[PDB]
Write a protein that binds this DNA or RNA. Structure first.
Ligand SMILES: Nc1ncnc2c1ncn2[C@@H]1O[C@H](COP(=O)(O)OP(=O)(O)OP(=O)(O)O)[C@@H](O)[C@H]1O
Ligand SMILES: [Ca+2]
Ligand SMILES: [Ca+2]
Ligand SMILES: [Ca+2]
Ligand SMILES: [Ca+2]
Ligand SMILES: [Ca+2]
Ligand SMILES: [Ca+2]
Length: 903
DNA sequence: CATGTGAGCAGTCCGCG
DNA sequence: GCGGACTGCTTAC
């Protein structure tokens, strides 16, 4: 097989690499890497090395990496550019793997672990590690086994061995319900003392050394705790055995009272699943406990236990160990669905970087561009220092706040990357500048044509048309990958709706789910078979289609983020190719594009409808337009339509057959105007929206910029079995909004858009009558707890103290000297509840760690002093007032002359 | 060590016979 | 109480 790296590190003048050899065996080696960098030399000196602007360079080969670094300093002092890849391990990988890496994940040791630590005096701080580690579960991907290390004797209690028989039993039968599919994969190892446990753990570690290390919060808890605990018991050099090169660095975050730390294990790639999830999932959650996220992703119940976690081991060691095991499995279950490890490995090896550098789009693109240029013997520019400078972005149209009955939306496919490719924006394709007219003059086609030779953006930049740029070249590769996966995602989504439609009439049979590939639209013959399947088989198929769609979502959305990241990186001062000329060339062109196409669409629709000067485009944001379709529907007349799907079909066809071509003509004309390299502005229809035919639903409304809701029947070619709400910016979409208020507000919207005013009014009345019966957690607001210390003045709020921070301080005083009430962690999320006047907490609100029940000693008082009136007003009524005034609708029946009668 | 800008809302402070 | 000014948080692109 072809060889590939696992990890790489620079340690002094040595590169330390772990890799897989030609026989599929894991190997390690230390290489005294001799790097090269480059300097500009005279034209009269012949050479095969040129910088990206075609200037000749000479290669300086160094005896070691220190010499290379030292030379960079001297060049800095002299005043001359030192070119080439200055991160030497990227150069090493590039030299060592001079081909497209094709890796085999079954050879890559992926470890998932978590530890338990009983602590009777508050949270067990990793920096101090003053308590025994009393459980570790460590799953190994190569063995496919859960290695369980169990401490039976501790100064906090001696317990009996864990029972696998009992673990496997249902909870309703006193067991722990450890999933049957992992029971046979558990290797249980009990220990009579911690020193033996830890030593065996370390020996195990040496035999099965993680390449990818993950788990939930392993970076800020598990890893530093294990490191510091081992350090305290055996000494630091023993702790260093967790690194295969015996090297670690300790990062100490001292904030202000007290301190925590991150540990870097050289030769391991740590990908904390919490960080993967945040970066790659595109959710914002009110809590990031594993219980919350597991329920969210997997619909599995919370791991239930009686009493505090500090007492769980002594009172119920059996459950304690089972839950340690299950927690580890849950991360594997989430990854099976989301496939973030796979994504990370894909992106890592594609770029030729340390796998953990997938968290940095700058490192990732720097590597991709370096490798690309190196293949043509080109030499990369030196990184430079730049002051941070704000610069202009997108254009957003101010919408008239209103209800909007029929709406069709369109937006550009991969807008910024497509602009890069169309214009040919790269560091080395800059041809010069031209004198800019006001943007409005370009939008209206009255400015002088910028150039009849070069490819232009209305920011004033010109680019070569007749040569490729590395930025366009490399961004197109990732875009094309993105597009493939998105095709699979949408097919799977369309396939899902076919199955949902068939679930309306399930057959009374015993059959199996069809063996099909969900990434491709079902053939007619598969669709016929589906119409004969049972409910059980159809639901299994619907599950598989949805898992296929999720996998496609992961792959497409993060490749999308990566290419958009390149456009953004051009405006980050730490990016080697930082250049506001290129960053603003993209954004300014975007602004022109949106406003140009708005004009063209208004022109076209006035023409086909026989009118003049009516505004069909009601909103737009960056690269999208929202077209009121009312006059289109009225042109034919609503009476002509047989059902909702008939008008949806009609608008879909109108968009595809009449609008999109007119849009394409408009953008081709714009491409000619700007003399661009290639026409890539593809503005495809997104949503078709309206009320159900014959209903009093209003279809949609806007309250303002970035705030709207649409009743959608077809989305990018997916015709829904049941209409779906597209809501942007409104409180339903905000993680700060209480969970039950999100629900209620969404149902208020659903009723507005699908049913009308009377339906709304009925629901609003019920919700107000029952609000006070909702669970306190379901109606608590959420906020991130940043800069808590700044406003902490003897446990009381300093000046400008934010509401949520004030609540935290209130909580701190109420739990003061409580030996095990959860502490609010800086930067994490909290629930927030307002408090009525005269409460015993002595302030207007309280805040506690999100995803948790508030500690029992103050829970009773919080429940008693909760200000429901304020809570209802702020979180529910005030937003709904915004929705309904915007829609010209009332959520309570207005008083009128009719109130004189008895109806 | 390091993707970007645009924009609304909820909060505090401050003014207000 | 209720605006305007300022800013933090969260989010749509
Ligand atoms: N996370 C982001 N970082 C940087 N720029 C972004 C980001 N999200 C959106 N943009 C910019 O706004 C543009 C339009 O956003 P949009 O969400 O429509 O994505 P897109 O790239 O056009 O892909 P799609 O084909 O899915 O519409 C992007 O092309 C760019
Ligand atoms: Ca635990
Ligand atoms: Ca788009
Ligand atoms: Ca059927
Ligand atoms: Ca868009
Ligand atoms: Ca699209
Ligand atoms: Ca109490």
């Amino acid at each position: 097989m072809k060889e590939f790296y696992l990890t790489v590190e620079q340690i002094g003048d040595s590169i330390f690499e772990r890799y897989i050899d030609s026989n599929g065996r894991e190997r390690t080696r230390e290489v005294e890497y001799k790097p090269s960098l480059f300097a500009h030399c005279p034209e009269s000196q012949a050479t095969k090395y040129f910088d990206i602007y075609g200037k000749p360079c000479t290669r300086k080969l160094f005896a070691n990496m220190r010499d290379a670094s030292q030379w960079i300093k001297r060049m800095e002092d002299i005043g001359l550019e030192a070119l080439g890849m200055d991160d030497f391990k990227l150069a090493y990988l590039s030299d060592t793997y001079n081909y497209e890496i094709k890796y085999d994940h079954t050879k890559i040791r992926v470890a998932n672990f978590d530890i338990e630590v009983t602590s009777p005096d508050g949270f067990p701080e990793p920096s101090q590690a003053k308590h025994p580690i009393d459980a570790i579960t460590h799953y190994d991907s190569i063995d496919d086994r859960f290695y369980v290390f169990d401490l039976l004797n501790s100064p906090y209690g001696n317990v009996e061995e864990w029972s696998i028989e009992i673990a496997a039993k249902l909870q309703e039968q006193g067991g722990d319900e450890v999933p049957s599919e992992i029971i046979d994969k558990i290797i249980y190892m009990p220990f009579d003392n911690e020193k033996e446990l830890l030593m065996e753990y370390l020996n195990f570690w040496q035999q099965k050394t993680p390449v990818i290390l993950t788990g939930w919060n392993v970076e800020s808890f598990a890893i530093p705790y294990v490191y510091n605990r081992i350090k305290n018991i055996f000494g630091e050099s023993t702790a260093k055995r967790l690194s295969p090169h015996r090297k670690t660095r300790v990062k100490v975050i001292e904030n202000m009272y007290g301190s925590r730390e991150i540990i870097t294990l050289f030769g391991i790639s740590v990908l904390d699943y919490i960080d993967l999830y945040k970066k790659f999932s595109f959710t914002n959650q009110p809590s990031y406990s594993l219980d919350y996220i597991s329920e969210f992703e997997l619909n599995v119940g919370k791991l239930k236990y009686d009493g505090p976690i500090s007492k769980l081991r002594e009172s119920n060691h059996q459950r304690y160990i089972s839950y340690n095991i299950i927690a580890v499995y849950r991360v594997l279950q989430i990854d099976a669905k989301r496939q973030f490890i796979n994504l990370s490995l894909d992106m890592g090896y594609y770029a030729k970087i340390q796998i953990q550098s997938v968290f940095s789009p700058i490192k990732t693109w720097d590597a991709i561009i370096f490798n690309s240029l190196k293949e043509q013997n080109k030499v990369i520019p030196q990184g430079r220092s730049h002051p941070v400078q704000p610069y202009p972005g997108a254009f957003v149209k101010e919408p008239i706040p209103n209800r909007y009955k029929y709406v069709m939306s369109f937006d550009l496919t991969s807008a910024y990357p497509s602009i890069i490719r169309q214009v040919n924006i790269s560091p080395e394709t800059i041809a010069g500048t031209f004198k800019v007219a006001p943007l409005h003059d370009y939008i209206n086609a009255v400015a002088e044509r910028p150039s009849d030779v070069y490819s232009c953006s209305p920011n004033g930049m010109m680019y070569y048309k007749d040569r490729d740029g590395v930025v366009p070249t490399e961004i197109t590769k990732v875009f094309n990958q993105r597009k493939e996966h998105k095709g699979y995602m949408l097919a799977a989504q369309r396939n899902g709706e076919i199955i949902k439609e068939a679930l309306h009439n399930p057959n009374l049979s015993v059959d199996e789910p069809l063996d099909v590939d969900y990434r491709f639209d079902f053939s007619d013959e598969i669709k016929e078979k589906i119409k004969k399947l049972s409910a059980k088989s159809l639901n299994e198929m619907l599950f598989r289609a949805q898992r296929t769609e999720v996998a496609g979502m992961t792959a497409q959305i993060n490749r999308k983020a990566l290419i958009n990241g390149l456009a953004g990186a051009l405006g980050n001062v730490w990016f080697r190719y930082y250049d506001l000329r290129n960053a603003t060339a993209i954004t300014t062109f975007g602004q022109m594009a949106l406003q140009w196409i708005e004009r063209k669409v208004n022109e076209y629709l006035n023409e086909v409808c026989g009118t003049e000067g009516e505004a069909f485009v009601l909103y737009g944001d960056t690269d999208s337009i929202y077209v009121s379709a009312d006059k289109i529907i009225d042109k034919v007349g609503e009476s002509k339509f047989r059902d909702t799907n008939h008008w949806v079909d009609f608008l879909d066809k109108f968009a595809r057959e009449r609008m999109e071509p007119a849009i394409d003509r408009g953008f081709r004309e714009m491409c000619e105007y700007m003399n661009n390299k290639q026409h890539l502005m593809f503005m495809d229809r997104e949503a078709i929206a309206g009320p159900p035919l014959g209903s009093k639903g209003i279809g949609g409304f806007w309250t303002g910029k970035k705030r709207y809701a649409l009743n959608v029947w077809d989305m990018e070619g997916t015709r829904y079995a049941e209409p779906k709400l597209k809501i942007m910016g409104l409180e339903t979409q905000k993680s700060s909004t209480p969970k039950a208020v999100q629900k209620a507000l969404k149902e208020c919207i659903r009723r507005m858009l699908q049913e009308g005013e009377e339906s709304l009014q009925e629901y609003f009345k019920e919700f107000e009558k029952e609000f006070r019966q909702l669970n306190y957690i379901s109606i608590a607001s959420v906020s991130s707890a940043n800069n808590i210390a700044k406003y902490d003045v003897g446990g009381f709020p300093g000046p400008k103290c934010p509401f949520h921070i004030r609540g935290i301080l209130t909580y701190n005083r109420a739990i003061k000297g409580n030996i095990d009430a959860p502490q609010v962690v800086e930067g994490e999320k909290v629930y927030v509840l307002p408090l009525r006047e005269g409460n015993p907490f002595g302030d207007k609100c309280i805040a506690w760690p999100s995803g948790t029940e508030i500690t029992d000693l103050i829970k009773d008082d919080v429940l008693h002093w909760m200000d429901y009136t304020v809570l209802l007003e702020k979180t529910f009524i005030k937003p709904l007032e915004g929705f309904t005034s915007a829609a010209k609708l009332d959520y309570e029946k207005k008083a009128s002359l009719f109130d004189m009668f008895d109806f």
